[PDB]
Amino acid sequence: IDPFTMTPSEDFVVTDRGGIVENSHRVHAAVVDAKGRLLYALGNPTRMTLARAAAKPAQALAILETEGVAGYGFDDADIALMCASHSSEDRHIARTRAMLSKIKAEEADLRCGGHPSLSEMVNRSWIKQDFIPTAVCSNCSGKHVGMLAGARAIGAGTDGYHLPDHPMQGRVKRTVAELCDLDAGDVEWGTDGCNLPTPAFPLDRLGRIYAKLASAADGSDAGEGQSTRCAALAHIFRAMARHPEMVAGEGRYCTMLMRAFDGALVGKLGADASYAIGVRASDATRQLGTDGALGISVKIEDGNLEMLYAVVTELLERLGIGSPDVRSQLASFHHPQRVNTMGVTTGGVSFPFKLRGSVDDPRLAAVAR
Amino acid sequence: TPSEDFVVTDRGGIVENSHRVHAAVVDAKGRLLYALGNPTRMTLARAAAKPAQALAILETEGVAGYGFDDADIALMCASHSSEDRHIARTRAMLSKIKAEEADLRCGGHPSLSEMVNRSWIKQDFIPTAVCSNCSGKHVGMLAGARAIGAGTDGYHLPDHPMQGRVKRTVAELCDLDAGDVEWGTDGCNLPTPAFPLDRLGRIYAKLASAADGSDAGEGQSTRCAALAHIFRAMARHPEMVAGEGRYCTMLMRAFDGALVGKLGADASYAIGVRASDATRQLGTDGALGISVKIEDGNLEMLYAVVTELLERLGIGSPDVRSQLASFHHPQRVNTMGVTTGGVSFPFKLRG
Ligand SMILES: [Cl-]
Ligand SMILES: [Cl-]
Ligand SMILES: [Zn+2]
Ligand SMILES: [Zn+2]
């Protein structure tokens, strides 16, 4: 009610029914440069956050930096599937089996389990057949095959490749902290749905990982000499952008986003409503005030995915990233339909949040909340 | 100032999501006894308003002649799972009023029970009007429109006398002026009210209080008698109010007449508790009402919080509440059988 005392604690996405507030959801977001400097924020941009599957490009880097993995001949689409929370479409299952074959492993070697598909259409096909998904159907199956590959390549057991004491998980933990530029004690660890260790760290550092992806892609495309790590980051970016259907699937936000942007960015979902985007240097990033790549990370405090995709699409519009025509491929996510059982629209979504970082009285405190 | 009351989920002790909780616990006159969050938050009651809409139906002149029974009234109060038995009862109620499915003005939707919906998907079933979770309410409004000789084609429109009756009855049960109730449109295409959350608790306290007064042989107005009947119908036929496995059904079965409870979509909940040792211990001499809203709309968190609140209020025994253990602490087990996290209730009741 007072535009001059607005605060991070008031950064919301709200749904209404005939103008009456239905639900409200707190938003947190960080927009960072290629070194992690914070450029813009919503909510608490340093919120300690479970990255969930948005950490997968970092886990893929740990796989690709494992000595001997290159000999298996994983291609870009295989790397994309390592980075994926796929919809368990037949092509994802088939590629998982092909990756198994490249390392001479079997489905029984996987330590992830089946689950209902992340795609409603795939799940409808499974329901019709009373199909029970198995390990090879896991949305994380590509990451698991990559972890198996790394365990085999260094001569570790494949037994227990998913456990924290295994050297593959030691490599993951170190790689995540290094990409975030954190000490190990500033990264916390739980266990994911796919039964791997999964990291939590300040939300802005998830943005920093993705800014580093995009920055590495810029350096590779420009022909700059790169470290082995930067070359591997550039390869991960390229793989995701070239095979975005491996990263998610038909009708999925990550796939539709990356297809619409045609190489300009990569993006990835984390469960419980986190999202991360790495944006290559562009006219839009320069207008935001940086000379290199950019990273964006978002968390919806209560975990609602429909709201996450609406907010991410709104934030891209506010940041001037893309064109209206590019972002219009995402219109169904930006303003989710609210049509009742008789075809009547009953309400909608609104975005009463305010990006900070672009000028207010110096006496307005922005308390991260 | 409202407290900062949350339910919080974790993964290995690391915070995953948090959800703001609003709750009101009120006496039979609506006086606020305990609260979480903002107990007066303006809130869409959604289907938690259905007992008030059922009252408007039952008070309509001539509706008694159709011979609706207790299970029919329960289905008027329902957000049912569209099980075959709910559809069958909808058709039986249509027949009682000499109407047809084509007269309904609600539409089909995926079932509120995931198990039912999977069964529909396997069979390529397209739900129709008679499968609406609100089908019983719609048959009741048809019945009221026909009973007073109003048109049936537009019984769902705000300008129809049945909707005028509903709008008046809701404000009267809330003890609000008409202008203090706001109205939107529900999923089933009826007008749907919003009012302060504590007033939703007040409606359910009046249900339970009427059940107590009928049980006790008090001189009741026709309205209190009808409220008592609604309470009794819900408690006697809780499977009509929701369905197998649903929180409302399991809650009411566990309590065996001691309370009624009802879900509103987007995570509101209302309970009417008959006077008991537990209510007297809370400091009231009559019935009480409980209303809850999860700010972000998460249903799993709603049922966890409602069950936690019952435990904090002492309502029921530990043995009775243990039937709801699966809702109180939702399972957090991964695809390989490993427990990955849990739910916590850092909130504190304000008295
Ligand atoms: Cl919402
Ligand atoms: Cl949650
Ligand atoms: Zn995983
Ligand atoms: Zn309805």
The residue ranges of every structural domain in chain A are 48-333
The CA distance from A164 to A173, in Å, is 9
3-state SS of B147-203 is HCCCCCCCCCCCCCHHHHHHHHHHHHHHCCCHHHCEEEECCCCCEEEEEEHHHHHHH
Phi, psi of B263 (to 5 degrees): -85, 140
Q: Which two tokens stand for residue B53?
A: 């809409």
Q: Which residues of A282-298 are buried (b: 16+ CB within 10 A; e: fewer)?
A: bebbeebebebbbbbbb
Q: Is B24 near chain A, with CB under 8 Å?
A: no
Q: Name residues whose C-beta falls within 8 Å of residue B205's C-beta, 6 or more positions apart in sequence.
A: B26, B27, B28, B29, B30, B272, B273, B286, B287, B288, B289
Query: What single string gives the DSSP state of each residue in A147-177?
Result: HHHHHHHHT--STTTTSTTSHHHHHHHHHHH
Q: Alpha-carbon dihedral of residues A149, B333, A85, B13, nearest 10 degrees?
A: -90
Q: Do B334 and A113 touch (CB under 8 A)?
A: yes
Please give the DSSP secondary-structure letter assigned to residue A345: B
Nearest to B113 by CA among B246, B241, B298, B303: B246
At residue A64, φ and ψ (nearest 5 deg) are -65, -25
Q: Is B84 exposed, middle or buried (0-12, 13-18, 19+ CB in 10 A)?
A: exposed
Distance CA B155, CA B162 (A): 6
Å from CA of A53 to ligand 3 middle: 6
For residue A200, what is the enclosing H or E element?
strand A197-202
B interface test, pick of A22, A26, A139, A163 with most B CB neighbours within 10 Å: A22
HEC per residue, A61-83: HHHHCCCCHHHHCCCHHHHHHHC
Q: Which two structure tokens, joined as six digits, stand for A77?
A: 């689409």
Q: Which residues, other chains included, contact A171 with Cβ-Cβ below 8 Å and sequence gap of 6+?
A: A62, A65, A66, A150
Distance CA A108, CA B20 (A): 43
| Residues A47, A137: Cα–Cα separation, whole Å | 32
User: Which amino acid would we find at residue A99?
Assistant: M
Q: Nearest to residue A295, comparing CAs of A64, A60, A29?
A: A29
Q: Which amino acid does the sequence have at A247? A: V
Asked if residues A148 and A103 have their Cβ atoms less than 8 Å apart, the reply is yes
If one looks up domain A48-333 in CATH, what number appears?
A: 3.40.710
A50 token code pair: 């479970």
A300: β partners: A27
C-alpha–C-alpha distance, residues B112 and B109, integer Å? 9
Q: Amino acid identity, residue A344?
A: V
Hey, is A32 helix, strand or coil?
strand
Which ligand sits nearest to residue A303's alpha carbon? Answer: 2
Task: Give residue for tokens 């598909």.
Answer: A117
Q: Is A143 annotated as a binding residue?
A: yes
Q: Would you list the DSSP string of A284-301?
A: HHHHTT-SS-EEEEEEET
Q: How far is the CA of B133 from the centre of ligand 4 (A)?
A: 7
Q: How far apart are CA B334 and CA A159, in angstroms?
A: 19
Q: A70: which 2 tokens?
A: 């290159």
Q: How far apart are the first and last CA of chain A?
A: 19
Amino acid at A160: G
Q: Is the Cα torsion angle A56, A60, A66, A72 positive or negative in sign?
A: positive
Name every chain B residue with its beta carbon within 8 A of the beta carbon of A15.
Answer: 297
Q: Residues 6 or more apart from B186 whose CB is under 8 A from it?
A: A340, A346, B46, B47, B134, B192
- Cβ within 8 Å, pair A24-B296: yes
Query: How many Cβ atoms sit within 10 Å of the Cβ of residue A19?
Result: 10
Q: Return d(Cα A115, Cα A151) in angstroms, integer.
A: 25
3-state SS of chain B is CCCCCEEEEEECCEEEEEEEEEEEEEECCCCEEEEECCCCCEEECHHHHHHHHHHHHHCCCCHHHHCCCHHHHHHHCCCCCCCHHHHHHHHHHHHHCCCCHHHCCCCCCCCCCHHHHHHHHHCCCCCCHHHCCCHHHHHHHHHHHHHCCCCCCCCCCCCCHHHHHHHHHHHHHHCCCHHHCEEEECCCCCEEEEEEHHHHHHHHHHHHHHHHHHHHCCCCCHHHHHHHHHHHHHHHCHHHHCCCCCHHHHHHHHHCCCEEEEEECCCEEEEEECCCHHHHHCCCCCCEEEEEEECCCCHHHHHHHHHHHHHHHCCCCHHHHHCCHHHHCCCCECCCCCECEEEECCCCCEC
Computed on alpha carbons and rounded to an integer, the radius of gyration of chain A in Å comes to 20
**Chain B residues lying within 8 Å of A136, measured CB to CB:** none
Burial classification of residue B234, based on how many CB atoms lie within 10 Å of its CB (0-12 exposed, 13-18 middle, 19 or more buried): buried
Q: Method of determination?
A: X-ray
C-beta separation of A214 from A237 below 8 A: yes
- Cβ pair B234, B252 in contact under 8 A: yes
Q: How many CA atoms lie within 13 A of B112 on its CB side?
A: 26
Tokens of A341: 């059982």
Q: At CA A37, angle to CA A34 and CA A41, rounded to 5?
A: 110
CB of A78 closer than 8 Å to CB of A241: no
CB atoms A341 and B187 under 8 Å: yes
